[PDB]
Assembly symmetry: D2
Homo-oligomer: 326 residues x 4
Amino acid sequence: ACMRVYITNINGQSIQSTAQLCQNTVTDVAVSLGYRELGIYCYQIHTDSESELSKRLDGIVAGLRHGDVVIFQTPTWNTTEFDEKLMNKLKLYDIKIVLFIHDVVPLGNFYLMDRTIAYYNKADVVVAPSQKMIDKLRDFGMNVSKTVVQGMWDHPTQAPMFPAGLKREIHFPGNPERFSFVKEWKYDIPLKVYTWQNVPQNVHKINYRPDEQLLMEMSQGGFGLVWMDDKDKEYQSLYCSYKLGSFLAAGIPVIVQEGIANQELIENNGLGWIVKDVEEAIMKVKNVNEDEYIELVKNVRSFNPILRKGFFTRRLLTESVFQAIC
Amino acid sequence: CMRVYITNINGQSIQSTAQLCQNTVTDVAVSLGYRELGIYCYQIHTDSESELSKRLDGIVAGLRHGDVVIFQTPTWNTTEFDEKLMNKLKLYDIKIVLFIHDVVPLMFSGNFYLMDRTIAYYNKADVVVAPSQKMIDKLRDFGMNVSKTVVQGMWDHPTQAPMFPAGLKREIHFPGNPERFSFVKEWKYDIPLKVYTWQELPQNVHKINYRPDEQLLMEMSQGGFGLVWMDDKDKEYQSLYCSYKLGSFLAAGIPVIVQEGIANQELIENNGLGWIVKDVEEAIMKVKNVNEDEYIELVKNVRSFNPILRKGFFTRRLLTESVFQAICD
Amino acid sequence: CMRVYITNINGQSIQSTAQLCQNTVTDVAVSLGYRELGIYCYQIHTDSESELSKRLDGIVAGLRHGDVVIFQTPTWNTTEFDEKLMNKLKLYDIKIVLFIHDVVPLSGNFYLMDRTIAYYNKADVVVAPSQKMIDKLRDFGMNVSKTVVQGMWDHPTQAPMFPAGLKREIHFPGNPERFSFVKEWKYDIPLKVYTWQNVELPQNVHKINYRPDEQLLMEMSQGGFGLVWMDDKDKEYQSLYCSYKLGSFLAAGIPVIVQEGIANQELIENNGLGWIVKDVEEAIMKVKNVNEDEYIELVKNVRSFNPILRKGFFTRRLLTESVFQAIC
Amino acid sequence: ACMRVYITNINGQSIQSTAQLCQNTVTDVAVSLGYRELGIYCYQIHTDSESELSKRLDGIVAGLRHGDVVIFQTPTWNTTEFDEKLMNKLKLYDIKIVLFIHDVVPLMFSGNFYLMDRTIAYYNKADVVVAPSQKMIDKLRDFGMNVSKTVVQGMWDHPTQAPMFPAGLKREIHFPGNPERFSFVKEWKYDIPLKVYTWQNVELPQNVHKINYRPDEQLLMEMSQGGFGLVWMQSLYCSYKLGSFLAAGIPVIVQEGIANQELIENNGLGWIVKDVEEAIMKVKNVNEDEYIELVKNVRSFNPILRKGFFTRRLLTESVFQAIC
Ligand SMILES: O=c1ccn([C@@H]2O[C@H](COP(=O)(O)OP(=O)(O)O)[C@@H](O)[C@H]2O)c(=O)[nH]1
Ligand SMILES: O=c1ccn([C@@H]2O[C@H](COP(=O)(O)OP(=O)(O)O)[C@@H](O)[C@H]2O)c(=O)[nH]1
Ligand SMILES: O=c1ccn([C@@H]2O[C@H](COP(=O)(O)OP(=O)(O)O)[C@@H](O)[C@H]2O)c(=O)[nH]1
Ligand SMILES: O=c1ccn([C@@H]2O[C@H](COP(=O)(O)OP(=O)(O)O)[C@@H](O)[C@H]2O)c(=O)[nH]1
């Protein structure tokens, strides 16, 4: 009996899926720690007889041995049915299971919240974006005793950082479809939106670029905006933003919405400003002098080796396996 | 973004050497930052064509175009399974390293019909790692035309078992099964023979029960000689394969006795790791005649050579060189 | 481009547990991609001041601004060396993790506390064996704000674990010159002492010759109980540290018996790894009574818990968390 | 007797030093393989007394033990005296020594030939020699180098994850080296533009675009947009520039003779040309499809350079050969 740690990893999604991006990046760190990938392909679950699905899963977990530990990165995006039966398959082994939450599907839409929580409760440790997320999940019946807070996505990279000049512009590499505040841009601060989609005056569309390029370009100065839409104001209070990690790894300060999860990280480390609303953000971008920009930048760049070396991830990947056995 | 993947069987008996080698190789591959494609040993005919195909899709779900895959063959799931795994792999734009642990039609007179199908699927790899040059030669004669070949040379035996000081015990160690090795029963000499096995034999042969490898290593290190031998039934294969027993003796820290004609025998010759003997009589005779002086030297050569074995360097180099060859012309 | 380095001592006797520890932490560290800053144990007074300085420049030659350095203390080259290594480290723009294996000023050695504390305080993060250790260190002026608790030693190993039978015997792989209760051993339960010392022992102590750790693990895994016991003058200083042999028993796969108030005692209780006893006499009683099933369970707890020990997870978490903390 | 592998690595040179860049790249690969760094700092050896030197060295190798293997990246650039002395220290341990040659000082010009005997003497204490090219090994043998086990490096790697942009057929030649070292640049006289990436002040001939020095990753991204990489100058060693071009994902043009050119030919990675004028011709005549093919070749071969495989093999093979 010789313990190995395995971790699930999705494959086959779009060139531009942040979801897969997250998992693959977590997995690369995990591989570097000695862990083993359980590759999972993103496909149409209805395409399998319930029996072919049982055996595709046997294919996926073929290397598993009792005494192992499995880190399940949820969701698989293969349907709650897949999630459920993957879990069920793992519960047949005499192993500890770490549930690593990237998103809670119902949070839209809301109905399957119950079957979601239900297989969640089968894990031994839960890793979640924030304590607020854990608290809110307990409210729906989540009863796993050992929980670990993720805090922040890393963003492992060796993209050169150029000196950050005080450009009074704002960067935002999300998609307008999901963020409608972007179409409502009123202010005379340029908003640089990085997206594939083609949809005001001061918003400037920029072509989707490989992540390393975006980082290099963003490092030349400016501010990074982390901002949700108005129903997404639920999550935001709960999830970890991926682009937040991308701003910080690039070496520029951030502007986040008052009430975002884990805001303490931003404050304690002097990484940017927590503002009430867009207006206040604009104001600060207009007010900030050369001095206080130079400070925020140096704060970001003394902080970001954590992000670029993948330590929030190495941290939770190590602690959760230990808590599972301990 | 190229990743390197390696297949690894699972599910066989704890006593199975085939799985033991594959796991060990995998353990070394993982340390090199490679990725496991786990494969479970089961009865292939409990699947419909659709199900087997989808079990394979599950096994290879993480592969992408541009990756490299090392197929550790055989899977012991049948030539049929090997062939369809290979077929799946060829749908990807990847390079395939075929790493041969055994050639199943060459190792049993009755498995020979499978030669042609085995070769056909061998010829789909970009690189073949074979135990010996002689095995590659033999493969060629049966139609194997894979242009790039790497010689494995020897099985490592990664470990940290204590090595005790080796005294000149005039005994011979043999951790194999009497079934696969019938000569055991016809043991007739007055030099003791220790047979380590889970399984009925002559007076000068002592049966010791199957221990976990680590303990076997510690015990063997106390001295004596490791015998690497095969019956005349397998004299053919012997000139071709790599013995795992060989690597276990040397890792333990004792000299070995091997039959003339065995694969990669110059390895033993040039590193002074034991004796190449014509027959069992010549070995028994050398064990009775060797003096303290000579045994001292042999043990010295073995324990200066065997860091390679214990740190997995034969495996590290084939794992590194084969992936390199798969890409570079 | 940040690298993590970790100090590691070399040159001590194959018997030195202090080196065995640093070396083990270092091995885990290297598997995590950290880099060794090798330190050799020698007579410091053989060095002129400038020689000592440049020997140190030799040790840290590979360091760069922006690196993170883990200092496993002490080096055993004496405090003067520890202090001079720390100052050398502070000359770089790096974050420093202090990893405490022992604290020298802890009775007549106490006078050294001022110097010891003054260099501890140059660290950004302190990893200490127990919270208790951290508290005592605070009473004497340690003010490093980020601290991590180690909570056990690991024992990474591949040692076969045999099935464990209930044997009413106690294993103690400790030097009997350092533990006196051994010479006083007066009980009908056999005490098995694994030691290099060529001396004879009380009637019911079985002197067993020193053996490679791997062999010791395998042998102990056949059953019996592992005793973690301190002398008497090492009693206060006891409560503080992490027992290395404790880790060895659990990694072998047998339950343990430890004195009341041992550092990180709750780990034993919360995981069902053995018993906390007042004194030897209670320990003898438990071993006399303890039944077959109750033992079976003790073992089950141990072997479900010990893959953490055997794969080095206490160390992996402290090496990972302390670096994170040094930057955060 | 637990064998560990160590590798020397220089530190403390300028950010522009290719020697350091190389030793550091090899070392990072070595660390991923589990090998341990012996960090060496570049200073002025005259500032040490004999005793101080001996103890600085003792500080550098404090972690070695009998039974280890040591890979010595030579030269250290602290001089031959330092290299000889480091080699002397190592020999005092019962270890095997791999000598990995980056440069041979006494072969740099005839003036430095007097150093050959000292150089060869200490080379000969090694158990294995890794050299850039077989040709180099042959030359060394002519001067008394007698280490029986040798390994050929072939090519520098270039570990990176720089995005590769699509390679447009730009009729331009990239050359990230400095002028004060390459005469041919100041003499440029072709209607084909030469993109020279340098930190130097100097203004440059008409059809040269002096581009400011830039981080390696950025350089790689820019070059991946297309055009040709030029390797120009001692066909003894491996060009580091070469690996940068191929990692960036564009084909190369190299001067006839240089070492290991059959790597170029056998993988269809560029052109081996007699002179500069031959290079301008091929850049003028080459058509769209011929160029898509070059790029195909380079981008299929690339992953070796980018994942550090020339280095992984020499680091694995040489340690193996040191014991076997
Ligand atoms: O041109 C682009 C724009 C987006 N991104 C990536 O997409 C991320 C943001 O995606 P998403 O909005 O889904 O992250 P979220 O903040 O919502 O968690 C950025 O940080 C980048 O990593 C990118 O690689 N190139
Ligand atoms: O008591 C035993 C006897 C055998 N072995 C293992 O079984 C191997 C021999 O198996 P096999 O005879 O199949 O090796 P090969 O024929 O390839 O030389 C030995 O080297 C050991 O590693 C073991 O672990 N415990
Ligand atoms: O025959 C022996 C006896 C001791 N030890 C090692 O020495 C440790 C105990 O040493 P020490 O008492 O110094 O550690 P402590 O428990 O006091 O921290 C054991 O756990 C073993 O790992 C060993 O390897 N072989
Ligand atoms: O703007 C620049 C110019 C050059 N270089 C680096 O310098 C290398 C060339 O160095 P050198 O000419 O010394 O190498 P050589 O080809 O002579 O071996 C390039 O490959 C780059 O990696 C760079 O990073 N940025």
